[PDB]
Design a protein around this ligand. Structure first.
Ligand SMILES: CC(C)(C)n1nc(-c2ccc(Cl)cc2Cl)c(C(=O)c2ccc(S(C)(=O)=O)cc2Cl)c1O
Ligand SMILES: CC(C)(C)n1nc(-c2ccc(Cl)cc2Cl)c(C(=O)c2ccc(S(C)(=O)=O)cc2Cl)c1O
Ligand SMILES: [Fe+2]
Ligand SMILES: [Fe+2]
Lengths: 371, 371
């Protein structure tokens, strides 16, 4: 069942903010690799003396890339006089986050009905406050609470093309319209040392209900309509687990993978694979000959032999459950450390029902099986 | 005149090493933007638990991109037991360099006859030692001395496709052969607060001879054959200077620009300009209508009206001196801060004579003039 126990009104995923060393180069790599458009900016050219922030958009998915300038530039500023466009930004936290964890997701942003209320309620139910609700230009309100490790859950809300006050639109010869068909964030997954408490903490302050060898135990938390999915993994050892390997290279808990829905996974993967070796993203090694042999018996009704074989061409993995089918594939790590990666997905069956077709639990032993 | 006063035998530029936050994304941006090939690597996959280093090559130009992993990975190592492939690497210095200056050049590497001797001699003539000569796998010897700010002059020497011991070749489906025609480093320029002492210091320890409004005073230091060019600028104020603007955003002295020679500047600029908005590098605003009108009188004999107008198409600036002509164009800053940039050049007239045609001093008042 889905209890619908949300403690405050949640709408949709709103954006993912990466904390980087140099925002410019990462966005520009991400843009070309993922087919994402340069749509907004906040930096020196827009009067921001604190941080450089660049927004990539594709359909409704928004990726934000941020880095700190020399503190010397804003040394005359105080919070009340700040030129930062994201009031929660902190030079030390960012440099500290980036030193300890490397390129990674700092904030999972969700749009809510009233972020002020979202923050209060959440903190009343045990959330660790990170940034208090700030009202920007009397139009947008943001707040932040701790999610897991140094990742924050960011609440955004609008009085109601615009990202945020202070961000300028790139509407231009500077924003080419790349688009490899990716459209929205499906899920955002965290790696933590202990699942239970992570779950109890997060479920405790949001009201998100459990949508709930491998080397992992996982659980999925979700909003009332199940359109915000926030899964969490923990490792398991002795008889290494790949979640532990993440925790060691990441220096503790963080965001593991960003599942990005595509309106056509075949075109998305043609386009992304054309660019792997030329500035884009590499993909995990393709499953076997045989794995494409066993899909013939199990996805039949979903997929004609033609649509199948072309999964074999693009290294797409398939899985299924009573509610539907799902097409997925995984990138290699996005940066230097073997930590955060990206998943490209498309769900068949089920607006459509959030979480349609599972998350590929099936694929594990059915890749395996083909070797 | 050129005195030929080198204190030790110098051969050619050998490589430029950038210190980055995340080496992976910068190399991958640089590769696509500049038409440079992924040729070698040293990282976790090659057994390097200390740093991730990725080599871009184009003709003879080598760009190296390096970043630190979590120190936790090599906590059991001591210098004698290190898995670093570049023995001079230091986790703190790198993170400290990167925090203070942001994306930038850490090392200007020159190949010498004997780096051990190069280091001793230089330190005997007043160089500030940075890293002592280390012999790698009984084949290559590197040493480092301070150049200016936190930039080091790196001496490399071979017992004699290989970069260095410990670097693996990417010879593969992983190293696509991009090539927009860039072939070698022409010059490497530093911005410092005071020109005199910088010059006296550097000229003092190398023996490099002086090959020697704007808002700057500059001087060019050069090797015996004048194939290694190491120019230095200082600012001038009151009656801001753009060198001062660099010094403020960079947090002091550093490397200003990398002049990259192309075997065909028109093809290099077609290819680079195709990619500006799609993961590549942006170029400074093109000079006027009129500037292309005045080239008609002054480059005539060098360039037919056809070859000229196509400078106007690509925003290429031209300049000249008795020894020859030179074609040049400048990128916008390569990273977040308005600091380091790249120059694309091609020299006509003058093997060819190092420094043929000047550095574009002429272009300054002749851009100006066209506005
Ligand atoms: C339940 C949840 C939402 C957290 N979830 N669980 C997985 C998942 C499944 C299996 C393994 Cl090993 C690891 C993960 Cl993270 C998961 C995956 O997106 C997933 C599915 C399959 C595989 S693969 C390529 O077959 O082995 C890898 C991953 Cl990472 C996911 O979302
Ligand atoms: C002598 C030396 C080797 C250091 N050198 N000097 C310049 C130079 C010339 C003029 C100004 Cl303003 C600044 C620099 Cl750095 C220089 C340039 O490569 C150069 C030439 C022209 C212009 S522009 C586009 O006309 O104004 C800008 C630059 Cl950055 C250069 O190498
Ligand atoms: Fe997933
Ligand atoms: Fe130059």
């Amino acid at each position: 069942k889905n209890p619908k126990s949300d403690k405050f009104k949640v709408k949709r995923f709103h954006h993912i903010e990466f904390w980087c060393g140099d925002a410019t180069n990462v966005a520009r790599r991400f843009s070309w690799g993922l087919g994402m458009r340069f749509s907004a900016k906040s930096d020196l050219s827009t009067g921001n003396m604190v941080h450089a922030s660049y927004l990539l958009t594709s359909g409704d998915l928004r990726f934000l890339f941020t880095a700190p300038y020399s503190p010397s530039l804003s040394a005359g500023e105080i919070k009340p006089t700040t030129t930062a466009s994201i009031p929660s930004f902190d030079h030390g936290s960012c440099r500290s986050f980036f030193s300890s964890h490397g390129l990674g997701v700092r904030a999972v942003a969700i749009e809510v009905e009233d972020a002020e209320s979202a923050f209060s309620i959440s903190v009343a139910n045990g959330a660790i406050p990170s940034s208090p609700p700030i009202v920007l230009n009397e139009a947008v309100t943001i707040a932040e609470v701790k999610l897991y490790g140094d990742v924050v859950l960011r609440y955004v809300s609008y009085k109601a093309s615009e990202f945020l006050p202070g961000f300028e639109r790139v509407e231009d010869a500077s924003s080419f319209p790349l688009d490899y068909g990716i459209r929205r964030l499906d899920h955002a997954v965290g790696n933590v040392p202990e699942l239970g408490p992570a779950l109890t903490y997060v479920a405790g302050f949001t009201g998100f209900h459990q949508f709930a060898e491998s080397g992992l135990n996982s659980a999925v938390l979700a909003s009332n309509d199940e359109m915000v999915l926030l899964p969490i993994n923990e490792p398991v050892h002795g008889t290494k687990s790949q979640i532990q390997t993440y925790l060691e290279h990441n220096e503790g808990a963080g965001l593991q993978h960003l599942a990005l829905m595509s309106e056509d996974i075949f075109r998305t993967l043609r386009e992304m694979r054309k660019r792997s070796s030329i500035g884009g993203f590499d993909f995990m090694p393709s499953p076997p000959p045989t794995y494409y042999q066993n899909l013939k018996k199990r996805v039949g009704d979903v997929l004609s032999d033609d649509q199948i074989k072309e999964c074999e061409e693009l290294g797409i993995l398939v899985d299924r459950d009573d509610q539907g089918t799902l097409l997925q594939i995984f990138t290699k790590p996005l940066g230097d450390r073997p930590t955060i990666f990206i998943e490209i997905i498309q769900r068949v069956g089920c607006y459509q029902s959030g979480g349609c077709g599972g998350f590929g639990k099936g694929n594990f032993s059915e890749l395996f099986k083909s070797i």
